[PDB]
Symmetry: C3
Subunit: 314 residues, 3 copies
Amino acid sequence: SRTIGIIGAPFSKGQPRGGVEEGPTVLRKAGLLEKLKEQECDVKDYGDLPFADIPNDSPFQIVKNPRSVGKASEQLAGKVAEVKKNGRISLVLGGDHSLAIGSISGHARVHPDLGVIWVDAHTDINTPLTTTSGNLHGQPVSFLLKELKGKIPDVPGFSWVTPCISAKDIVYIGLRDVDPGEHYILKTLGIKYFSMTEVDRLGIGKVMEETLSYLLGRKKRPIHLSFDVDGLDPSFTPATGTPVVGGLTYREGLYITEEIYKTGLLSGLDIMEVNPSLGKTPEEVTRTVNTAVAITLACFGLAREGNHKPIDYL
Amino acid sequence: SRTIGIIGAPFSKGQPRGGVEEGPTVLRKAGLLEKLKEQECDVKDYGDLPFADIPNDSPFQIVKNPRSVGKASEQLAGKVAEVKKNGRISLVLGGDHSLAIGSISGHARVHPDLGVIWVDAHTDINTPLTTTSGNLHGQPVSFLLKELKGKIPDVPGFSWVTPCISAKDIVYIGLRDVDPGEHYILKTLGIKYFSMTEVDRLGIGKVMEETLSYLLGRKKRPIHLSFDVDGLDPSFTPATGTPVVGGLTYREGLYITEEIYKTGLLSGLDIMEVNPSLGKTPEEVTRTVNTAVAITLACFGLAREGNHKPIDYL
Amino acid sequence: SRTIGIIGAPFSKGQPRGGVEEGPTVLRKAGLLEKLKEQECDVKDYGDLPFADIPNDSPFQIVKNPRSVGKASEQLAGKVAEVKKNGRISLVLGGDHSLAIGSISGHARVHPDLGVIWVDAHTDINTPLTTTSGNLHGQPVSFLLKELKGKIPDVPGFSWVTPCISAKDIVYIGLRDVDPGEHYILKTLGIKYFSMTEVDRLGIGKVMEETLSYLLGRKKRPIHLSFDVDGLDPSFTPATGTPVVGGLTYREGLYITEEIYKTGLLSGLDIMEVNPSLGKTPEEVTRTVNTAVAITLACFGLAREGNHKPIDYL
Ligand SMILES: CN[C@](CCCC[B-](O)(O)O)(CCN1CCCCC1)C(=O)O
Ligand SMILES: CN[C@](CCCC[B-](O)(O)O)(CCN1CCCCC1)C(=O)O
Ligand SMILES: CN[C@](CCCC[B-](O)(O)O)(CCN1CCCCC1)C(=O)O
Ligand SMILES: [Mn+2]
Ligand SMILES: [Mn+2]
Ligand SMILES: [Mn+2]
Ligand SMILES: [Mn+2]
Ligand SMILES: [Mn+2]
Ligand SMILES: [Mn+2]
């Protein structure tokens, strides 16, 4: 049976807009922990991480808040590894997506053979040198990939990072805002991806079959799902910092996560980039958090066809 | 050519919210009868059923308004059988979904070999003993299924019911809010279903091919379509009592019904759960009724590709 | 590499509502020309066409403004042929869809072997004799088809027209409001079409594979894409004169145009029926123009998966 470890990561300095720090808080007050208990799940809350303010953190070239982002990920890596050693599925509530550096790193210390599914409008694979914004939430994958070592500069705050995943061990789903440098890396490294074009072409059904066969065909291994809520269309998740139109539907998001749950191999989960302060109305915040909660519950067994306990209901 | 018998069923006591009684009225004032005449159809209106008030109707255990629901279905069964004996396709305008007990029962008196297609967010297959709400609109299928006799208590108002359909003769499309007891019955009885997960997986195209091959592969027979407007997403049909997000699209609803029309075997139709009083705005009511009318017109021949009379237009 | 010739066609008299004349203006102020330059494209603006007022233009039978529509198309045909002789892809910004008579005609003077893809809720294939509205924007295809000569009356303003395309050389995508006369022509002439029913059945992926194999299977040839913004659902393009619900999605629109771009054979493009004055709000106008611009950029190489220059980004 599923056992879960919840880690709050109230961190925003991987991007400019502040309110993503309240992500863990609004997801908890939506009753995420209770709803997980309502279904099959043994839940332990490891709390919100205390991220010290590092007030002296000047840009490294164009890269903003590098020491703050680096330490937050260092701390998160430690907590995630701690939850994995305890035999639980780590559930990280973000927080901006730079935290994936820490989440995937901590996870990989215990399960070096993990495969990553990255649901997002973005590849987040800019390097400190290709980025034009300097926002580190658009860079976490570059820090993680083995093939890109020697292309990543010695950024203050990140000396602890050892890139733990090969380009062959990640699949993107939902891409529709990919920078030129990122596209170059994507094609050069031969990374498997299903942009919105592929989802339109094949249907989400075939996308998931291909995703899972690619990642699990040779050998069964732990899955890490890094879910950026901007992966889904802004009609479902508007309260987020970098919304892009033409996204995955609510249905597609639940299909992705239902299929991931059914593998029995989900080992780590990130629910990222919920920013309640960017909702144009109270309903837009509710709609975003509701969807993120629904996505999460699907990851842990809630099926649209229904669920039942192993007894005779009649 | 198609010949139709319209029966209004202004009934609400299968659920708590009152305004579903006005379903027949708003569908008629939308010009449903006229629009049916505009296309190929010979239409006879059998009127709105007069449902006597039964003021003495205390719950049977948890089950609410059982005598009221039972008599309404008894009356509707009689009217439907009357319209079928006259060689017409029965079109029942609801009204809450408990009325399906009467619609399917009346239909089956004349065509015992009918197969049912049930488009809905819900299976409506709770028994009087598995229900946690007591609302009979969530129970009609349990009263209809032969396999479940002996599991249905002697509910006041329902002594006239003889379950007329086998578990093998129904297909669900659109499921996304299925209670644990219902899921148990679903799996135990081996009922064919396409929840939203299956629609996402396969596409509505394959769903309809499988639905129709399953029901009509061995032997051609009459089709009964029980269409709950909550089958479609609340962005298309918001004015309904139990809306669930992540539903079938407008397009999917028209595809289902276009394909059903093309079989030449539609024999009975229910258009259920339109509640104009639950529209948050006047436009939400219009949008809901418009969609329900569009769905109905598709059932009777209106095709998106166009239609033409058997003459030379040039 | 792609080279483009922009032609503004501020013309409205193919239909009753006036504001479609401002189509070229709002598309330009959206920064269409600049955004085309931002990506691979060499852009030359051939200006907005000066359409003389023809104040004496009484209906021909039921057909409205025939001399105005005819001359506007005659003028546009000349300009388009001029841009094609200069080796550029013609990009016509409309303007109502009657202008397609001129766009396709001018294009075909230089490339007689063109195949047409027509993305629209409508077939626009009524003749002056089958039309019930008299609005010429619902008639341009009938003037273009060789198979229909002798069925088109001598309409004032159109003596210059020579029908340049066979019924075999056009594919419709997006149909859901087809008049009886149009359906008759569709079936009689054996025109290839994918109404919304077919898109639902097969998926846009298979639709494009079939569309392109049909048009380009025997012999590679120039493609003319006539894109009516009402092809997409009114939730994406509301500011248009004849919106029909149940349309192609934003994603489907970009998929169509991405796949068309990838053939390397796009030769002519029409972006038609944007009417900013019919937006119920300022956001509805912005949403419509934004989408039309996005559609256009996709036609000229912008891919959702990303794009990059032929250099080493690392
Ligand atoms: C696509 N790259 C962006 C967005 C990063 C989003 C990170 B996420 O976690 O939400 O996915 C934007 C770069 N563009 C900004 C607009 C102009 C072109 C560059 C970046 O800052 O790197
Ligand atoms: C899913 N079952 C419900 C809804 C019935 C809808 C009937 B219809 O005709 O619209 O399809 C709801 C039961 N749940 C209520 C919420 C808490 C869990 C139980 C019930 O009352 O049985
Ligand atoms: C479908 N035909 C219409 C619409 C033409 C739209 C042209 B376009 O460029 O936007 O595609 C409408 C005819 N109907 C009007 C409503 C009643 C039935 C006839 C016509 O006027 O011919
Ligand atoms: Mn993102
Ligand atoms: Mn991201
Ligand atoms: Mn229902
Ligand atoms: Mn129902
Ligand atoms: Mn049109
Ligand atoms: Mn058109």
